[PDB]
Amino acid sequence: ANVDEAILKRVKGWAPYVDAKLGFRNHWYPVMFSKEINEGEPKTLKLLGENLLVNRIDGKLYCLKDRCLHRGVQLSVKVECKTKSTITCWYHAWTYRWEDGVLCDILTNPTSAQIGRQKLKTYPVQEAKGCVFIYLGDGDPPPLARDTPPNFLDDDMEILGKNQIIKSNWRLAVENGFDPSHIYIHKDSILVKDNDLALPLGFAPGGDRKQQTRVVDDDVVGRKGVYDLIGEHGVPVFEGTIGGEVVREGAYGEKIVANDVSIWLPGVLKVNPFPNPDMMQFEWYVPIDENTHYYFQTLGKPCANDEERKKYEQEFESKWKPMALEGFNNDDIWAREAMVDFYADDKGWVNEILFESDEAIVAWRKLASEHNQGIQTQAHVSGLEHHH
Amino acid sequence: ANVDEAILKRVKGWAPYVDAKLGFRNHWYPVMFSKEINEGEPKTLKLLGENLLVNRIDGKLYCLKDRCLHRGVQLSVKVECKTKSTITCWYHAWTYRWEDGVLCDILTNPTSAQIGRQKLKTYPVQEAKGCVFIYLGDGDPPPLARDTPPNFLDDDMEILGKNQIIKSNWRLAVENGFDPSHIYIHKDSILVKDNDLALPLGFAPGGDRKQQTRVVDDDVVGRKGVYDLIGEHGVPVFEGTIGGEVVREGAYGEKIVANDVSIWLPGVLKVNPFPNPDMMQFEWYVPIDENTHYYFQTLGKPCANDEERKKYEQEFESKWKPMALEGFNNDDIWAREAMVDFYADDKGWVNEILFESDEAIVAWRKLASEHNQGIQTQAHVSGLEHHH
Amino acid sequence: ANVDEAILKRVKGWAPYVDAKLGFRNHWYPVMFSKEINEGEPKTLKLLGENLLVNRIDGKLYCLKDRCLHRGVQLSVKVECKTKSTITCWYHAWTYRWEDGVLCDILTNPTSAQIGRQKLKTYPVQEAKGCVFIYLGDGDPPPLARDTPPNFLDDDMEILGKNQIIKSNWRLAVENGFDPSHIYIHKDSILVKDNDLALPLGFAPGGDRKQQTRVVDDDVVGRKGVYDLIGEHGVPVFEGTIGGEVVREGAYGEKIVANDVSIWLPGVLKVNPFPNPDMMQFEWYVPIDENTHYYFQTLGKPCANDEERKKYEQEFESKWKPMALEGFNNDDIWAREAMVDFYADDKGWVNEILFESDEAIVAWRKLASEHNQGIQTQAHVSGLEHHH
Amino acid sequence: QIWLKVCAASDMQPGTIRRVNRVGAAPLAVYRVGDQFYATEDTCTHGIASLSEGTLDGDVIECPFHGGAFNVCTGMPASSPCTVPLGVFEVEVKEGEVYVAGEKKLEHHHHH
Amino acid sequence: IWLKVCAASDMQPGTIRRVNRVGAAPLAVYRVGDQFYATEDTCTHGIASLSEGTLDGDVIECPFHGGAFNVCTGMPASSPCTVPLGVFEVEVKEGEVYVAGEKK
Amino acid sequence: IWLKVCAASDMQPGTIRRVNRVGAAPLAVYRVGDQFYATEDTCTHGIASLSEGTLDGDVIECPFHGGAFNVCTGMPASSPCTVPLGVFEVEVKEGEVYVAGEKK
Ligand SMILES: c1ccc2c(c1)[nH]c1ccccc12
Ligand SMILES: c1ccc2c(c1)[nH]c1ccccc12
Ligand code: FES
Ligand code: FES
Ligand code: FES
Ligand code: FES
Ligand code: FES
Ligand code: FES
Ligand SMILES: [Fe+2]
Ligand SMILES: [Fe+2]
Ligand SMILES: [Fe+2]
């Protein structure tokens, strides 16, 4: 456990989720874009608290844990790839194969008994839609589709995006993203006026608890997630009042967006259609360490040919990225950061005072608790400990 | 429970005081000057570890805890006062009344069952002598006079001052201020020469322990404090010697100051007369968190009309503030800071080696331990806890 | 202890060493060069976590703990040496003798009962070879010779050096320095080429484990150390291969250096001859606190007269200092820093995967564990604790 | 209406809880402590949890969300983080049939 | 030399009595069971009065910081005390308590 | 093919015995009760000699970092060990212990 047992004991409906401060192990996670990693140019990154090294050899990606088995230094301090298929630690020259992590040579002692008898941790790496996904887990990985939202991998779905490091636990990012009522913070986004969007300030729930969402655990692909259906029976708020007097109004644009929002394990949201009626948004909140995450944003738009892909890419740079990914989502960034203090000591998970629209968040917490493939622990980071 | 129980058990005479790392709850504390808080201009501050918001509406001051009941974000990240008598959290628009903290509206869901069934914490606030006092406590507040030194509230006493944040626990500031022997650090202050002050280097106590101070716990308004009477039977030190040879002398000025010094709960010192024979100094050491405090300095001088008040104000800005509040007390600031390391781990409360003049400080420690109105704890900051 | 008992329990061969994160008490340590402290000019420094003050009075050095007995402030915040043989605390004027640390006077209360009945901690200080050594221990100190490598104190040995603060625990520095295989990190040093040195990439061990090192448990002066004998029967590796292909070669210079390398308690390395056939290198890794150390480098060369010493001094500044002390050892600095994370949580002491050449490090760890004169604890820093 | 028919007193075992949904109103929770029946709002005052899905220990109901609790007889908070009192509804057994009031009790016209 | 303190019965078992001495530091007389002992009253660690402390067997605990001393040897029994207390041998003759005038 | 270790009676139950081989890596012979087992002496996690460790039942604990292996199967029993230990065939004939030259 990564959290005080007294707290976990109190949270009977989603203790595993609360305990998963470091993220869920045995899931695929996007960490960079294919174009960011060149042939023979190793790149470092931290995923779920683990320091990793990614390299492209003969066009294919390989992932090695960035920590020599010998004295635990990061190989990346001084990269020495002496042959196309290996990397040699700069310290005592222990050499590892990129494909299987096997310690194949030691330049400081070619007669060492450790040669061929030790193996550096490797992780599966797969590129899809110009995105680099890493399976931070053990054993043969499941198909990538299990950890991706519906349609992301569609043949003609052109994926473009942006990635950066955000200072907040991944869970605060997830819940902010799937939060039905947080739409309020986007009321002044330039995207609203500049793209003539229809956007309420919130929702007056309607129907029973079960009707508030659609829990998906019967997906043939294995996907596990939740759909937010607060808008099916709820009355959208377009006139916000105080004391019965209207103080704020929603956006009365013509473009209808986000009629279906869904969150999927290990932590990826799908907003459709967004930021335009003919587009979709897929964003991951990838755990780096307990205090940070990658905010991996992608926008998808069907494209039949290079012409459309080019015009889309062109439109991405000039409008969507600056007006949507940035102009709209930037407020999500400081919103996440604003929740850090309340949850930093883990007490926020007990003292939070939820209201109706949080039913969606609750459903996600339970789904995540029930269908995650493993709880990452600090011991996974330093080295598993046991006595048997 | 703010300190290791092993340490507290060792301190039989003033354990509660050593435990009061965050300060004493249920007392009035000055946090700013009236002119610093304008109409409809919310100001943030941290008091006893709690983030607070203060606002002036129709001239009156109101204080709300700067933490939304929903997801615990500070309302001040993006202040939204949509109506004169309320503030709306920028996240999901939960709206509260400054007047009683009641959650009166929720723009994102007007049908929410939470509306009218939740109340944000509010604290009493009142202005006196141009100073803003906040009652960081629960229930109906006691008269302000109880937590102020005698004469601070006298009709003709014109109060002026300065406030700032100092990096030291509040108790270190209190003790340095009420310390009879620390006068040594002020031997070279510009105020000594520039205002022709008589100032010894220290004191050779005379008489018994009881005579060294006067414990006040019979005051009618209920104020509790201690008067330092060391100079009543003790010989002032004007010739500092080492091995019997004079190496330093005190100041032989004409103005007699600091005839009586007293410290009062929750932590305010009174030096009379100072810095001039016709003035008084009242200074508070307000706890912000365990590592910092507000150094709330005030100088009082009787005035009978606006003519003298304006005169005093001009003398304050050109002489008293720079020559005394700063020229004299600046040494107190780094002196307090110099004791941080020794007490930071709470070990200094055990290892300190006191001498005779510290009898005054010990009296204050015992008085504070016995008459404080409550020990602020981390639980007060995050949310009081209790299991059936 | 200083480390999790569950960890110490696992390390049966050198638990005390792993526990000694703050260093070994009751040993001499160099902290500065003689020319760095002048007559009547007190100097501050931190050794084994303790703040100390060193002063030169009538040519002789004296060391006092830089922490007043009264309120625990550092005397050095505002130095007041009012008589040649004393120092007066700037706070309440408690005065101490540099000679024995006795509290001889208190300017603020000349009649105090504390005078002559309290004593500030003092540590023995000795100058040798232009180096300042402090005995960070209790009771009468042993000969300095016990804590120095053989020949460092030879009558004709001329010592010149450099000192700086490095960000790594002292042990990581000691192990890197005595590490037979770390020579690999020096393969591109300017010294190797500019001084035509022969330098292998490493060693293929030969003989039995017992032949890999030579432990000296006792000397005529009680020295405790270990000599690295890997090159006695080992095969120097000049060509590094990966999968049978040569990817790197050692240096085939003509100068043979580092005939013998030995590490001695409390943590000083002797490389002979180095960096030139007619010189010797002695370097200490002095514990400052748990995260940093003094990298005290010295180069020695026998000199019979003033002409030789002068010539050597010239060569040191123009060649050896920049080409060797810096051009060669700078790589050791970042090598040490690279091991910080792995051992920072004390887990590296369990998870490290050693190979053959590490027998030297293991021998050092056991020797240090068995012959150190005491484990410095945080309690030594704040004040020893014992409850009846 | 004034009295809401819930069930037969015999359909509830000691130490159990029953949720009572009402048309156009918030749900109630009826608890059986021994052979006595008490009722309160079903929704925890600390959030949106259903107390009838919680754990009843004697006369104290524990919310499943955050571990808060209430005394089912007085509706007063028994464990943090709960601070707001539950509305309490009178229950009575007529002909072995359990009835719960349609309106909550008030600090109106009772013991001083 | 010797100074008459009081009648043995004036002190209940396990109690402490401060003995003021004009022109000199006060002393502390401890009654451990039916045995009597005496040391300097002022804790060697500060200004605390040991006679206002707690006696546990023949060990006096200072009320200020929990430091302690063995009232028979005067040696520190608990930190932060490090300076040995001054010991004064006591004499009980005819139900009368006398404390030596000199240390040791 | 086999090597003479010692007479079974020379080893008390629960003890370890290092078997040094000329021109080869050392072996470790353990006696668990009345049965004998053998494995590589060198811990797979480093360069420690398991014969200098502690035997608890059929599990040997390395003196270096506390890692452990089951002496019967040679499989890792405690972290940080992960690499299986090479196990060697042992025979007891005429009250004497014999260890196979090559691992099984
Ligand atoms: C409603 C409308 C838009 C959005 C939403 C809910 N959730 C989102 C998350 C990321 C980007 C856009 C949205
Ligand atoms: C003696 C003389 C002056 C002062 C004092 C004691 N204590 C003080 C605290 C604040 C400002 C001045 C003084
Ligand atoms: S730390 Fe990598 S080879 Fe030694
Ligand atoms: S955090 Fe304030 S309304 Fe949700
Ligand atoms: S802290 Fe040094 S004399 Fe008071
Ligand atoms: S919702 Fe019931 S304790 Fe929080
Ligand atoms: S004054 Fe007695 S233990 Fe400190
Ligand atoms: S060398 Fe055996 S457990 Fe590490
Ligand atoms: Fe958003
Ligand atoms: Fe002062
Ligand atoms: Fe080196």
mmCIF file of N, CA and C in Angstrom, chain C residues 280-310:
data_model
loop_
_atom_site.group_PDB
_atom_site.id
_atom_site.type_symbol
_atom_site.label_atom_id
_atom_site.label_comp_id
_atom_site.label_asym_id
_atom_site.label_seq_id
_atom_site.Cartn_x
_atom_site.Cartn_y
_atom_site.Cartn_z
ATOM 1 N N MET C 280 53.121 11.058 -5.668
ATOM 2 C CA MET C 280 52.125 10.272 -4.946
ATOM 3 C C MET C 280 50.858 11.088 -4.741
ATOM 4 N N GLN C 281 49.702 10.435 -4.795
ATOM 5 C CA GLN C 281 48.454 11.149 -4.566
ATOM 6 C C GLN C 281 47.755 10.595 -3.336
ATOM 7 N N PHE C 282 47.392 11.497 -2.427
ATOM 8 C CA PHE C 282 46.682 11.151 -1.201
ATOM 9 C C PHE C 282 45.402 11.981 -1.242
ATOM 10 N N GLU C 283 44.240 11.335 -1.199
ATOM 11 C CA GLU C 283 42.990 12.093 -1.209
ATOM 12 C C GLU C 283 41.959 11.585 -0.211
ATOM 13 N N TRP C 284 41.387 12.528 0.527
ATOM 14 C CA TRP C 284 40.372 12.248 1.539
ATOM 15 C C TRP C 284 38.977 12.573 1.005
ATOM 16 N N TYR C 285 37.984 11.841 1.496
ATOM 17 C CA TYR C 285 36.582 12.051 1.138
ATOM 18 C C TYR C 285 35.975 12.272 2.530
ATOM 19 N N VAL C 286 35.979 13.527 2.964
ATOM 20 C CA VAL C 286 35.526 13.914 4.300
ATOM 21 C C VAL C 286 34.031 14.180 4.447
ATOM 22 N N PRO C 287 33.362 13.449 5.355
ATOM 23 C CA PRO C 287 31.922 13.642 5.557
ATOM 24 C C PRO C 287 31.592 15.036 6.104
ATOM 25 N N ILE C 288 30.757 15.773 5.376
ATOM 26 C CA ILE C 288 30.304 17.098 5.794
ATOM 27 C C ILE C 288 28.922 16.861 6.412
ATOM 28 N N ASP C 289 28.039 16.209 5.657
ATOM 29 C CA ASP C 289 26.721 15.811 6.157
ATOM 30 C C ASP C 289 26.379 14.552 5.371
ATOM 31 N N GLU C 290 25.167 14.023 5.507
ATOM 32 C CA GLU C 290 24.845 12.792 4.795
ATOM 33 C C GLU C 290 24.832 12.877 3.264
ATOM 34 N N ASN C 291 24.748 14.082 2.712
ATOM 35 C CA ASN C 291 24.693 14.239 1.257
ATOM 36 C C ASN C 291 25.936 14.832 0.616
ATOM 37 N N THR C 292 26.894 15.273 1.422
ATOM 38 C CA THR C 292 28.063 15.902 0.840
ATOM 39 C C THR C 292 29.378 15.634 1.565
ATOM 40 N N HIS C 293 30.480 15.843 0.856
ATOM 41 C CA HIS C 293 31.793 15.619 1.438
ATOM 42 C C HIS C 293 32.827 16.585 0.907
ATOM 43 N N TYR C 294 33.956 16.648 1.600
ATOM 44 C CA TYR C 294 35.062 17.469 1.142
ATOM 45 C C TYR C 294 35.914 16.512 0.319
ATOM 46 N N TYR C 295 36.274 16.914 -0.888
ATOM 47 C CA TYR C 295 37.154 16.100 -1.713
ATOM 48 C C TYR C 295 38.496 16.816 -1.527
ATOM 49 N N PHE C 296 39.237 16.364 -0.521
ATOM 50 C CA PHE C 296 40.526 16.938 -0.151
ATOM 51 C C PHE C 296 41.666 16.241 -0.898
ATOM 52 N N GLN C 297 42.113 16.844 -1.997
ATOM 53 C CA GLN C 297 43.177 16.275 -2.821
ATOM 54 C C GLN C 297 44.568 16.801 -2.470
ATOM 55 N N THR C 298 45.564 15.915 -2.452
ATOM 56 C CA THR C 298 46.942 16.335 -2.215
ATOM 57 C C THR C 298 47.886 15.518 -3.100
ATOM 58 N N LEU C 299 48.952 16.164 -3.555
ATOM 59 C CA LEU C 299 49.966 15.500 -4.366
ATOM 60 C C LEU C 299 51.266 15.675 -3.602
ATOM 61 N N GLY C 300 51.968 14.569 -3.379
ATOM 62 C CA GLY C 300 53.212 14.640 -2.644
ATOM 63 C C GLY C 300 54.429 14.246 -3.454
ATOM 64 N N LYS C 301 55.536 14.925 -3.180
ATOM 65 C CA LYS C 301 56.789 14.642 -3.858
ATOM 66 C C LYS C 301 57.946 14.947 -2.911
ATOM 67 N N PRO C 302 58.862 13.982 -2.740
ATOM 68 C CA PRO C 302 60.001 14.211 -1.848
ATOM 69 C C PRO C 302 60.821 15.394 -2.358
ATOM 70 N N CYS C 303 61.193 16.289 -1.448
ATOM 71 C CA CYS C 303 61.993 17.460 -1.793
ATOM 72 C C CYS C 303 63.054 17.641 -0.710
ATOM 73 N N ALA C 304 64.315 17.724 -1.122
ATOM 74 C CA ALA C 304 65.420 17.861 -0.178
ATOM 75 C C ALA C 304 65.759 19.296 0.208
ATOM 76 N N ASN C 305 65.463 20.243 -0.673
ATOM 77 C CA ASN C 305 65.777 21.636 -0.386
ATOM 78 C C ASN C 305 64.682 22.596 -0.826
ATOM 79 N N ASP C 306 64.931 23.888 -0.641
ATOM 80 C CA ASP C 306 63.964 24.911 -1.013
ATOM 81 C C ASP C 306 63.863 25.079 -2.529
ATOM 82 N N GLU C 307 64.956 24.809 -3.237
ATOM 83 C CA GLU C 307 64.950 24.930 -4.690
ATOM 84 C C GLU C 307 63.977 23.908 -5.272
ATOM 85 N N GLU C 308 64.082 22.668 -4.802
ATOM 86 C CA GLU C 308 63.215 21.588 -5.260
ATOM 87 C C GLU C 308 61.752 21.862 -4.931
ATOM 88 N N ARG C 309 61.490 22.315 -3.709
ATOM 89 C CA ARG C 309 60.127 22.615 -3.296
ATOM 90 C C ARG C 309 59.541 23.702 -4.188
ATOM 91 N N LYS C 310 60.357 24.703 -4.509
ATOM 92 C CA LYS C 310 59.930 25.804 -5.365
ATOM 93 C C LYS C 310 59.582 25.286 -6.761
#
